[PDB]
Write an enzyme that holds these catalytic residues in place. Structure first.
Site, PDB file in Angstrom:
ATOM      1  N   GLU A   4       6.862  -9.363  -0.457  1.00 34.84           N
ATOM      2  CA  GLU A   4       5.238  -9.073  -0.081  1.00 34.84           C
ATOM      3  C   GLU A   4       4.698 -10.244   0.743  1.00 34.84           C
ATOM      4  OE1 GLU A   4       3.010  -5.587  -2.389  1.00 34.84           O
ATOM      5  OE2 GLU A   4       2.471  -7.670  -3.155  1.00 34.84           O
ATOM      6  N   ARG A   8      -1.002   9.556  -3.051  1.00 33.11           N
ATOM      7  CA  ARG A   8      -2.095  10.607  -2.593  1.00 33.11           C
ATOM      8  C   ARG A   8      -2.126  11.149  -1.254  1.00 33.11           C
ATOM      9  NH1 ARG A   8      -4.241   6.110  -5.532  1.00 33.11           N
ATOM     10  NH2 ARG A   8      -4.694   5.194  -3.593  1.00 33.11           N
ATOM     11  N   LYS A  48       5.656  -7.759 -11.024  1.00 31.48           N
ATOM     12  CA  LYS A  48       5.430  -8.897 -10.036  1.00 31.48           C
ATOM     13  C   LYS A  48       5.329 -10.253 -10.737  1.00 31.48           C
ATOM     14  CE  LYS A  48       3.314  -6.105  -7.017  1.00 31.48           C
ATOM     15  NZ  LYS A  48       2.341  -6.620  -5.916  1.00 31.48           N
ATOM     16  N   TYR A  75       2.569   0.430 -14.046  1.00 30.06           N
ATOM     17  CA  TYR A  75       1.261   0.312 -13.551  1.00 30.06           C
ATOM     18  C   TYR A  75       0.056   0.676 -13.743  1.00 30.06           C
ATOM     19  CZ  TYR A  75       0.235   3.477  -9.608  1.00 30.06           C
ATOM     20  OH  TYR A  75      -0.058   4.501  -8.783  1.00 30.06           O
ATOM     21  N   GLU A 133       2.216 -12.421   2.475  1.00 26.78           N
ATOM     22  CA  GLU A 133       0.715 -12.817   2.112  1.00 26.78           C
ATOM     23  C   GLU A 133       0.590 -14.123   2.448  1.00 26.78           C
ATOM     24  OE1 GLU A 133      -0.710 -11.750  -1.619  1.00 26.78           O
ATOM     25  OE2 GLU A 133       0.910 -10.348  -2.374  1.00 26.78           O
ATOM     26  N   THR A 183      -0.647  -8.206   0.491  1.00 26.62           N
ATOM     27  CA  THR A 183       0.264  -7.842   1.409  1.00 26.62           C
ATOM     28  C   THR A 183      -0.515  -7.704   2.787  1.00 26.62           C
ATOM     29  OG1 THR A 183       1.616  -6.812  -0.104  1.00 26.62           O
ATOM     30  CG2 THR A 183       2.027  -6.309   2.205  1.00 26.62           C
ATOM     31  N   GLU A 195       7.100  -0.533   2.806  1.00 25.09           N
ATOM     32  CA  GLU A 195       6.310  -0.152   4.069  1.00 25.09           C
ATOM     33  C   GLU A 195       7.406   0.153   5.136  1.00 25.09           C
ATOM     34  OE1 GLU A 195       1.989  -1.496   4.386  1.00 25.09           O
ATOM     35  OE2 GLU A 195       3.505  -3.068   3.299  1.00 25.09           O
ATOM     36  N   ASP A 216       4.854 -12.505  -2.368  1.00 25.07           N
ATOM     37  CA  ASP A 216       4.792 -11.906  -3.910  1.00 25.07           C
ATOM     38  C   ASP A 216       5.929 -10.892  -4.262  1.00 25.07           C
ATOM     39  OD1 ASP A 216       3.713 -10.929  -6.374  1.00 25.07           O
ATOM     40  OD2 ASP A 216       2.250  -9.692  -5.769  1.00 25.07           O
ATOM     41  N   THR A 262       6.975 -15.384  -7.859  1.00 26.08           N
ATOM     42  CA  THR A 262       5.925 -15.606  -6.726  1.00 26.08           C
ATOM     43  C   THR A 262       6.280 -16.659  -6.025  1.00 26.08           C
ATOM     44  OG1 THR A 262       4.272 -14.280  -7.783  1.00 26.08           O
ATOM     45  CG2 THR A 262       3.680 -15.358  -5.857  1.00 26.08           C
ATOM     46  N   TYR A 286      -5.941  -7.618  -2.321  1.00 23.25           N
ATOM     47  CA  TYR A 286      -5.527  -6.382  -1.492  1.00 23.25           C
ATOM     48  C   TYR A 286      -6.035  -5.781  -0.265  1.00 23.25           C
ATOM     49  CZ  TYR A 286      -3.089  -2.176  -2.734  1.00 23.25           C
ATOM     50  OH  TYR A 286      -2.219  -0.893  -2.587  1.00 23.25           O
ATOM     51  N   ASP A 319      -4.689 -12.165  -6.868  1.00 22.35           N
ATOM     52  CA  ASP A 319      -4.156 -11.684  -5.886  1.00 22.35           C
ATOM     53  C   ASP A 319      -5.091 -10.507  -5.340  1.00 22.35           C
ATOM     54  OD1 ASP A 319      -2.354 -11.500  -3.874  1.00 22.35           O
ATOM     55  OD2 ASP A 319      -0.738 -10.412  -4.968  1.00 22.35           O
ATOM     56  N   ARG A 325      10.035  -2.645  -7.252  1.00 25.37           N
ATOM     57  CA  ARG A 325       8.951  -1.381  -6.771  1.00 25.37           C
ATOM     58  C   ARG A 325       9.554  -0.258  -7.861  1.00 25.37           C
ATOM     59  NH1 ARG A 325       5.406  -3.646  -4.094  1.00 25.37           N
ATOM     60  NH2 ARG A 325       5.547  -3.924  -1.931  1.00 25.37           N
ATOM     61  N   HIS A 377      -1.931  -1.837   4.870  1.00 22.87           N
ATOM     62  CA  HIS A 377      -1.168  -1.952   3.746  1.00 22.87           C
ATOM     63  C   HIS A 377      -1.648  -0.944   2.664  1.00 22.87           C
ATOM     64  CE1 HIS A 377       1.460  -3.468   0.276  1.00 22.87           C
ATOM     65  NE2 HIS A 377       0.276  -3.347  -0.237  1.00 22.87           N
ATOM     66  N   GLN A 422       7.647  -1.360 -11.119  1.00 27.82           N
ATOM     67  CA  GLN A 422       6.113  -1.490 -10.854  1.00 27.82           C
ATOM     68  C   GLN A 422       5.371   0.238 -11.011  1.00 27.82           C
ATOM     69  OE1 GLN A 422       5.199  -2.237  -6.972  1.00 27.82           O
ATOM     70  NE2 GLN A 422       3.057  -2.321  -7.150  1.00 27.82           N
TER      71      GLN A 422
HETATM   72 NA    NA Z   1       5.706 -11.833  -7.597  1.00 24.69          NA
END
Ligand code: NA
Ligand code: NA
Lengths: 427, 421
Positions: free
Chosen positions: A209, A152, A263, A254, A211, A360, A374, A243, A267, A138, A136, A247, A143, A250
């Site tokens: 997600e 950040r 995740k 992560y 995708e 995503t 988002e 996906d 899926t 990115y 998967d 959250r 996104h 995660q």
């Molecule tokens: Na998933």
């Protein structure tokens, strides 16, 4: 030969195919695996509101393949796919010819039509392939910038490496399931802001997600990379891919090894594989890349695809779904070719049936972001639902649907749907 | 089956009764082998021989549940799927048959020549089809060493941190491993360059093979976890450190580990490891309830890594450590893998994470041993290393030390081929 099968003027004697809104016109012809009361799961091709039973068609002599082992007895498409592009095209060409409005051969043989066609309404669809591996990526700049903004400050949101390579991770193959499979809300460790220690419980920020994923059609040997320019020849087709992400689970797990449990619980992919050949008329110019990537990642020509995408959410018992995201595949910053080249640049081998997720898909506008994380900015601006009510993250009973399609002149090549309803967490 | 763990038991296959042999009658690991006699098929190591399970079955000397023939299969998956009662039944029949005093096969020379194959004349293959490969991070000392370069985040001690590995590129001991190319970030240049990995490394690990899966959405309770495990192997998670540093934030390592992962060919069953079960380290803080278990769930497995330069007469021992020091156990890893609903399948490979002890000669990678290329390792026979060089052969070995015997893992080896140019 096969480029004639993309002719927008072509039509079928299966009349439902010629509806402008039908995902499965004669121009599409995606491959899948289906069962019915007639028989066990086996290969099929969608057309109008029907399915072509490939095995049955072969027994009747109306479609022929390379002499060899019988790939149409198989409960997955892997064996068929392994036969290679000449076979994919040969079958596509035979089907297009046979189901063309003016070919009387099967059309006027009522008895045989009742044996080789099955209504989608009477069929059950299964995972089209055995997935040996699932990777998967990115590759949506928007996104990645949105998500990095929650960790950040704005200046630091997109890390430099993101623009130098198609960032990716290994997904969990085992838990990829077909559209329609109910998805149980996961339990796991949740870090609350005001407690030193994590607690265990039901996910409170379950999310989708949006995708797409591509299916590998020819692998490569361990130690032999796929050149960016040869990459697309290795790709069989595409599907929609949800996906599902927890959250809260995660955020806590992560760092540094990436997302894992958050995740891997489920899926979902759509059942019908839309072949790359069928997407040829929707090939468009990918976005400009800046800075210019290293040589091994460069390719000439057009390698993006114009696929309108939409996500809906329907609360349990609601008469209508709410459209929460509209976006398009063409905006992805890294292409399928570049992802596949990058996957193999160090020697890693790919295999027939491998699933590769785009990451995503998010556009530039607030109504084009491909997750609720988002869309609601982590639960701060809830989404109003058609019919009353509102959501931050997904609630028990909600049904989430991904849809996608390529808009031609008076027809569309569509992906079907990629759906799932959420079951309560185990206690 | 606990009678098969008796240290006093011995075989009429005399090489098994050498104290140094990895494959005494107490062990009996499962694998897949081929020879000139036939295509790849299930076998069991004993002394310097292999037991041809299919051939033994045809002769009526080992029986399995009535059903489809799992011993015609080119992998052990079908056999494993039959479950623990079968694994034990087969182990018990083998232990009895190859016990020094059972004349049945020992005195039948003609039949011995049909059912036994010297390891010398066999080729070993991946013992299972791996549907998924997950890799954990459960050595405190390793995680503290690595984090101290770029120490232990709070979550590390709250859960067995892990990621999804790449199944496709897991290969059997003996497979040559090509040095990978990829993006390298140099300290003095704004932009990455593309080239041959300059910090190729090993990662000493073990991995366990799942013997019973679980359905999607149904977690495996920590306390039931070990019953789902068939056995263990040695695992070299080859790593390109320069590729890794540059790629890994935020989604974790990808290309840097996916180019190759090597496992030893013989699966040592968890039953055979029973006598070496020991107390795992104390965990502090006390983990959440779902991760707790009663009893002893660590295993006492001495581990060693050697490095032999191309054409060197002797290898250099670069790491000596032990499996027992891992902070999270196999049971806890498997529980954590499934706590959110993720399913596991027969044949799944689960890596321990790099195994590092407390001392400078017990770290499980060259990154650690040489502190990122600052303190090179001297080689037996002259010369020195930071990271692995073309032609070098890296070997993992592992074994459990009993009184006058050992249950051993064999080897997990590979020689490095030059990068494609
Ligand atoms: Na998933
Ligand atoms: Na590796």
């Amino acid at each position: 030969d096969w480029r004639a099968t993309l002719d927008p003027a072509r039509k079928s004697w299966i009349e439902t195919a010629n509806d402008p809104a039908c995902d499965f016109p004669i121009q599409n012809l995606p491959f899948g695996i289906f069962s019915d009361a007639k028989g066990a799961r086996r290969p099929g091709v969608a057309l109008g509101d029907q399915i072509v039973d490939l095995a049955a068609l072969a027994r009747a002599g109306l479609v022929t393949l390379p002499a060899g082992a019988d790939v149409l007895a198989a409960p997955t498409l892997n064996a068929f796919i392994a036969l290679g592009r000449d076979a994919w095209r040969s079958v596509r060409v035979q089907l297009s010819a046979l189901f063309s409005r003016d070919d009387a051969t099967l059309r006027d043989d009522a008895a045989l039509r009742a044996q080789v066609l099955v209504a989608q309404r009477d069929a059950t669809l299964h995972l089209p392939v055995e997935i040996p591996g699932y990777t998967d990526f990115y590759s949506s700049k928007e996104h990645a910038t949105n998500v990095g903004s929650m960790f950040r400050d704005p200046k630091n949101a997109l890390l430099p490496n993101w623009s130098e390579m198609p960032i990716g991770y290994n997904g969990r193959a085992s838990s990829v399931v077909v559209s329609g499979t109910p998805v149980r809300r996961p339990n796991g460790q949740l870090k609350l802001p005001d407690q030193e220690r994590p607690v265990f419980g039901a996910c409170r920020k379950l999310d989708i997600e949006l995708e797409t994923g591509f299916i590998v059609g020819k692998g490569n040997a361990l130690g032999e990379p796929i050149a960016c320019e040869d990459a697309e020849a290795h790709i069989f087709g595409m599907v929609l891919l949800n996906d599902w992400s927890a959250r809260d689970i995660q955020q806590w797990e992560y760092v540094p090894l990436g997302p894992f449990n958050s995740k891997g619980f489920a899926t979902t992919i759509s059942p019908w594989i839309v072949t790359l050949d069928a997407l040829e008329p929707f090939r468009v110019a990918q976005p400009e890349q800046s800075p210019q990537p290293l040589a091994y990642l460069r390719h000439a020509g057009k390698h993006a695809f114009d696929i309108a995408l939409e996500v809906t959410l329907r609360a349990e018992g609601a008469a209508e779904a709410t459209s929460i995201c509209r976006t398009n595949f063409r905006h992805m910053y890294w292409t399928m070719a570049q992802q596949l080249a990058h996957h193999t640049v160090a020697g890693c081998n790919t295999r027939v049936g491998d699933l590769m997720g785009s990451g995503t898909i998010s556009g530039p506008t607030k109504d084009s972001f491909g997750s609720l994380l988002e869309l609601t900015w982590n639960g701060k601006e809830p989404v109003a639902l058609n019919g009353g009510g509102s959501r931050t993250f997904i609630e028990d009973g909600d049904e989430l649907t991904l849809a996608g399609w390529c808009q031609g002149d008076g027809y569309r090549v569509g992906f079907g749907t990629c759906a799932g309803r959420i079951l309560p967490a185990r206690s």
